[PDB]
């Protein structure tokens, strides 16, 4: 059949903010994950429920690639059962997650020496996001009891902050792209498979 769109998710120029993680429907393809192994020295390739090696000899019902750039000191939060600003308010994976997390350094691409403010992260929210949830809103978060409006104030602040990634910052503060391939393998019909 037709090859799988593993391009446009790894070879993309810019990825998306964490609060606007994009999902790409991957169906009716022959998933040849071998093109990822020789892509770059990933910092993390933790697969839950499946082994990275024994991955091209199976089929999946519908796989979704979640792309988003996170900070280095919070890459441990993109995993099952984790907690934190990004885990609770931006992107939360379920405890029963069955997929692979692919993280690698992107300081050479997503980090300008003047500040890449095009990547934002949600810091304040009145409730924690549920698994596979997105919040693209930009409403001012009321921390105090005083009413608020469309303008910031001493007690209601903006919900989205900017990660000022710079090449001079040390490890942990550098940008780290993430590709969370969510698998769902069961008796359901198979739309994507490996190279036989």
């Amino acid at each position, epitope marked *: 059949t037709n090859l799988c769109p593993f*391009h*446009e*998710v790894f*070879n*993309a*120029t*810019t*990825f*998306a903010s964490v609060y606007a993680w*994009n999902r*790409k429907r991957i169906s009716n393809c022959v998933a040849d994950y071998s093109v990822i192994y020789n892509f770059a020295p990933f910092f993390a390739f933790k697969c839950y429920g499946v082994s990275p090696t024994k991955l091209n000899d199976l089929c999946f019902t519908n796989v979704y*690639a979640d*792309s988003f750039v996170i900070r280095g000191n919070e890459v441990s939060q993109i995993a099952p059962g984790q907690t934190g600003n990004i885990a609770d308010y931006n992107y939360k994976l379920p405890d029963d997650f069955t997929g692979c997390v692919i993280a690698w350094n992107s300081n*050479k*691409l*997503d*980090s*300008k*020496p*003047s500040g890449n403010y095009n990547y934002l992260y949600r810091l304040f929210r009145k409730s924690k996001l549920k698994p596979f949830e997105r919040d693209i809103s930009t409403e001012i978060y009321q921390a105090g009891n005083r009413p608020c409006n469309g303008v910031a104030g001493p007690n209601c602040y903006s919900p989205l902050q900017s990660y000022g990634f710079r*090449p001079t910052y040390g490890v942990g503060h550098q940008p780290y792209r993430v590709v969370v391939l969510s698998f769902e393998l069961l008796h359901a019909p198979a739309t994507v498979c490996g190279p036989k």
Partner: antibody, heavy 121, light 109 residues
């Protein structure tokens, strides 16, 4: 001020394996990408590749995967084009470009003067 | 993919002109990876449009752009003799930049 000068004209014959250079100044030649663009007589621009002076990470175009290699000497802030076994088709004005502080890492913001390479006999 | 660009275009001073760039790509993270470059005879390219919803610094405000599906456009709100140069569109969505064939604008005056 931010400047980006290239080597002078290089008239060469097939097989001499010349090298073009681009001397950058006015910025940190370690965090900004640097590449080259080809423009044959009368035709349009053609991208060849870029290199990150920090680490030897070179991204080439499918049409220039092995026809030419890009290198950068971070100690002197210079990028080079190394041709091996030149051909008569390599005649073109090669322009250097760098990232820029405006857009994405791949967007060419600032350009150079361009070096004319003539492969004739 | 490959971008196509009408080799030749025309216009009149004080009026406007449009350039078509078909073949724009797309990736996971954005779809506005379109930029335009100007190049006079015997000079180097000069970026004039990046992030089509945005403009560079120092470029006149009459160089605005619009996007329409897999096609982008460049509008010169007021043609002048200094605009008689080639224009190349670029698509840098898939980490590989692709230039067009150029559009030679011949202003009439």
């Amino acid at each position: 001020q931010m400047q980006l000068v290239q080597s002078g004209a290089e008239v060469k014959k097939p097989g001499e394996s010349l090298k073009i250079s681009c001397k950058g100044s006015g910025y940190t030649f370690s965090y900004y990408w640097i590449g080259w663009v080809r423009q044959m007589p009368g035709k349009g621009l053609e991208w060849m590749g870029i290199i990150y002076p920090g680490d030897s990470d070179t991204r080439y175009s499918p049409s220039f995967q092995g026809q030419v290699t890009i290198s950068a000497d971070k100690s002197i802030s210079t990028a080079y084009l190394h041709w091996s076994s030149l051909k008569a088709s390599d005649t073109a004005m090669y322009y250097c470009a760098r990232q820029g502080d405006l857009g994405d890492w791949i967007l060419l913001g600032y350009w150079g003067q361009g070096t004319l390479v003539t492969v004739s006999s | 993919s490959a971008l196509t660009q009408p080799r030749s275009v025309s216009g009149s001073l004080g009026q406007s002109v449009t350039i078509s760039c078909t073949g724009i790509s797309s990736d996971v993270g954005g779809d506005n990876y379109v930029s335009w470059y100007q190049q006079h005879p015997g000079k180097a390219p000069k970026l004039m449009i990046y992030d089509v919803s945005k403009r560079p610094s120092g470029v006149p405000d009459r160089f605005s752009g619009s996007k329409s599906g897999n096609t982008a456009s460049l509008t010169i709100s007021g043609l002048q003799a200094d605009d008689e140069a080639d224009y190349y569109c670029c698509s840098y969505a898939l980490s590989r930049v692709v230039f067009g064939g150029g559009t030679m604008l011949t202003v009439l005056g």
